Amino acid sequence: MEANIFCTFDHKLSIADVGKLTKLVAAVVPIPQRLHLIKHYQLGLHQFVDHTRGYVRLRGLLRNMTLTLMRRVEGNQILLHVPTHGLLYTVLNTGPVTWEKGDALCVLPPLFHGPLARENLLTLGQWELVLPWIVPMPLALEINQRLLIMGLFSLDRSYEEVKAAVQQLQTITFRDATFTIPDPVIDQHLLIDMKTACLSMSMVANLASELTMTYVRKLALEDSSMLLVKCQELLMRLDRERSVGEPRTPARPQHVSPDDEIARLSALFVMLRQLDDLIREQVVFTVCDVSPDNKSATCIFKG
Amino acid sequence: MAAMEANIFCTFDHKLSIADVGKLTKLVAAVVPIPQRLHLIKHYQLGLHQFVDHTRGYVRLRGLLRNMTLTLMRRVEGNQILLHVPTHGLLYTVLNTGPVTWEKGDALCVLPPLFHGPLARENLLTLGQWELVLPWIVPMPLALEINQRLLIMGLFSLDRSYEEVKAAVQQLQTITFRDATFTIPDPVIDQHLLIDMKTACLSMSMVANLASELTMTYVRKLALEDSSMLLVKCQELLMRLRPQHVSPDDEIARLSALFVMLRQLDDLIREQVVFTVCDVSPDNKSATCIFK
Amino acid sequence: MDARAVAKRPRDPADEDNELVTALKAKREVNTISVRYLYHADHQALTARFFVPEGLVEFEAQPGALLIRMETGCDSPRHLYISLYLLGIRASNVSASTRCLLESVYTASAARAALQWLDLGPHLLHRRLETLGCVKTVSLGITSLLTCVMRGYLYNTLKTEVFALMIPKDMYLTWEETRGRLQYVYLIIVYDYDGPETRPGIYVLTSSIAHWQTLVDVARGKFARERCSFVNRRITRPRQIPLCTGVIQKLGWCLADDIHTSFLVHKELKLSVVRLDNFSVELGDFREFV
Amino acid sequence: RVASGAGLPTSRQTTIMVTKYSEKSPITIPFELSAACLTYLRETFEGTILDKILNVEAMHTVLRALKNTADAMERGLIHSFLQTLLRKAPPYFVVQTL
């Protein structure tokens, strides 16, 4: 015997459709919440698909979702099984990028591009079974940086320079197959998720400026590590060695309200908490040996 | 020696009343930090109580617990105490102590207790001029707020006069969360908290240098042409009344170091999860968890 | 269901016959293979076979060494498995006498050119490196079959002997005169900054500290010299964007009491090394810190 | 069909065929048991008078969970069956119009 998670459907199943599940004997399946029974609506990432919400909303929900590999497809039932940490678990290479031995694979929400290519395997009446990409860790650090820069250029667009620079970020180039990352922007106006995220960096990028000035000058007096004196001049923010304009010291806040200065610090870290989901990529699998043709590979579970 | 034991027996040396021993049965599956790990531990070493100081600094108590090994309570008898070290990855069940909504699916981080709004606080246990103290397990969003405000207390004390600082502390000691008030047990500005600023103060200036020329202006770009609740509200919070460098090859790497400082700056308030809730009991007297 | 299904003691696999025996017992066939006791049926440890060029067989032929994959800009081979000792010549931590010592052993048709792949790039070494584990049962050949240990204790087959990790003495350091009974191991790359190029050192740090917050704080003191170089390069070189004074990562844990100094002797050459004994493996992600 | 007179449209034979399908709705009953009740029901200590009593309650507690699980299986079978009929039952004013 072994612990399992039954997941029966509801719509009638053609026998030919069950054979597409036989190709998915061992692949990652996100689950909104652990349960001993799960409706096929809850099954897959499709339950959280959204219209105006951007890619960030999927990643922010998927990180809380519990991963669960497929075990043994059968008749009306689905035998899902949750991996235990510290044990190896084979995973199907649903991910577009070929796996390499020893990489720290980590889940990311899917990013299907423009022209149609691979189709979703289960379009069972409006609902369809999308699956998150399985990607090596260094690329997952890369794809996250791409979408955020594209949101920084979500405002300006008419200039040709931004118009081309987004096209370069759109086209990733890596080992073996190359791919294209769809633009989060659509119909000029930005999606609300990227606007919430791009402002979260814009707050820290600017609110940190004036607020940190008073805190540098006082702590630097000790000259303990001595670096704080260099830190005081780090805030001038310039490249060229500017001459005799005579504000050699960084600009400092003035006439701030005694209580509002506390709230500005509260407005600082709160932006960091909303931004935190993009900041980190928890590992979920670590591949060891890889099967030929990269169809699948054994991966010890992590997290 | 042998690897530190998964199972630890603590035996109470002091005589205890027949009424108090039944409180341990209600205390089953509590999170009990221990100092040195050993197969058999004196009860004076048991609990958080020994680390208290006359300074009563909260910031140090928050730090010392993070180096301690947590051990879930299990199976109380007439004297034996079956502490059980939680090996990572197993699905442990954790009885709750401090009053909080919990709610399913939140991440958890152990923290020192924060006394409730009456200020009255009956001890969970007493035993000869010594009192057991179990640090509270709290939801992750709650832990981020209680931890960051202490850093706000330090930076605010660095400049303004001591009379204005103490009046601000009463505004900072309160923390509403899930319609439940809480208060810090004697927050203190101290050398233990003084280093919290210096690791932050260097962390702040690095973001100003790593910031792109557009990213600092990016909020001003939105206000110039658009308006919204978040835009107008943040505009009051900070700013006083085509890109010049289109270098995607630079920005792709310039942010890559900027993400590093965002990891370090968050880590001052971020802490490693100790448990991950699955299904809080409707009685809210127990919770289901994993991590370790 | 019957109460016997829940009141029963957990099943002992040793009480059960081996699964290959069950198919034979049903038909009373007698194959030449002896399946009455399967070997390697009881191993918490996890492993993977690694085919490696013969030019890196040195030193690793003694069990216990930190394999680390190194991706390279060349598309073939895509992932050479550098020895940790082979990376020490790049390290500034190694003593100039020790650097000249081992380096003569590494001359080869392949390993001697392996160092060139490090110098060519602009990005920092940790972006290429990826910890794999530890050696056990080298095959020794023109294409040796190294067996990495992804997790669990190193040991000889059939538990005949517990292999020990070999940490070179120059990279080792201690955080306290009085170690705790437990202390996690942390491989660390440190990037000191200089004009023409960074010259990273390597460090392995057993420490009773386990929580990541308290772990990085003590490093901020001992490596403050390189930390001063980190901010100094930033104000010096705009457009240039150095990052991360170092990179901690978890690697494993040891009982501390078992540790004692030792030395490996390959090709009649002594090499003093710290020697963790019963060292369980618990690898983790690189964790950058500034 | 029915016969009709001359000068009128007739009724050619109209064979008709249809196929019903089937629905599904599995149920499940969690139930907890204290780890002490399992270890006392399993291991038997010295024949002290008190331990025999605690072993007796440990034995009866499992029957209290199993019989509760079986009765819960019947309550859910009635519940899932009535829940099945409610989805199949049209509102009455439609059946009256039909």
Swiss-Prot record, chain A:
Subcellular location: Virion; Host nucleus
Subunit and interaction comment: Interacts with TRX1 and major capisd protein/MCP.
Chief localization: virion
UniProt keywords, alphabetically: Capsid protein, Host nucleus, Virion
Similarity field: Belongs to the herpesviridae TRX2 protein family.
Protein name: Triplex capsid protein 2
GO molecular-function terms, A-Z: structural molecule activity
InterPro entries from the UniProt entry: Herpes_capsid_2
Organism: Human cytomegalovirus (strain AD169) (HHV-5)
From Swiss-Prot, chain C:
Recorded family membership: Belongs to the herpesviridae TRX1 protein family.
Principal location listed in the UniProt entry: virion
A Pfam short name: Herpes_VP19C
GO biological process, one term: viral capsid assembly
MF term (GO), any: DNA binding
InterPro entries (alphabetical): Herpes_1 (IPR004999)
This protein's GO CC annotations: host cell nucleus; viral capsid
Role summary: Structural component of the T=16 icosahedral capsid. The capsid is composed of pentamers and hexamers of major capsid protein/MCP, which are linked together by heterotrimers called triplexes. These triplexes are formed by a single molecule of triplex protein 1/TRX1 and two copies of triplex protein 2/TRX2. Additionally, TRX1 is required for efficient transport of TRX2 to the nucleus, which is the site of capsid assembly.
Domain of life, source organism: Viruses
Lineage of producing organism: Viruses, Duplodnaviria, Heunggongvirae, Peploviricota, Herviviricetes
Species of the source: Human cytomegalovirus (strain AD169)
Protein name, per record: Triplex capsid protein 1
Subcellular location(s) of the protein: Virion; Host nucleus
Assembly behavior: Interacts with TRX2, MCP and capsid vertex component 2/CVC2.
HAMAP family from the UniProt entry: HSV_TRX1 (MF_04018)
Keywords: Capsid protein, Host nucleus, Virion
UniProtKB/Swiss-Prot annotation, chain D:
Localization, UniProt: Virion; Host nucleus
First and last residue of the signal peptide: none
Transmembrane segments: none
Family recorded in the similarity comment: Belongs to the herpesviridae major capsid protein family.
Subunit structure: Homomultimer. Makes the hexons and eleven out of twelve pentons. Interacts with triplex proteins 1/TRX1 and 2/TRX2; adjacent capsomers are linked together in groups of three by triplexes, heterotrimeric complexes composed of one molecule of TRX1 and two molecules of TRX2. Interacts with scaffold protein; this interaction allows efficient MCP transport to the host nucleus. Interacts with capsid vertex component 2/CVC2. Interacts with the small capsomere-interacting protein/SCP.
The protein's role, per its UniProt record: Self-assembles to form an icosahedral capsid with a T=16 symmetry, about 200 nm in diameter, and consisting of 150 hexons and 12 pentons (total of 162 capsomers). Hexons form the edges and faces of the capsid and are each composed of six MCP molecules. In contrast, one penton is found at each of the 12 vertices. Eleven of the pentons are MCP pentamers, while the last vertex is occupied by the portal complex.
Full protein name: Major capsid protein
Name of the encoding gene: MCP
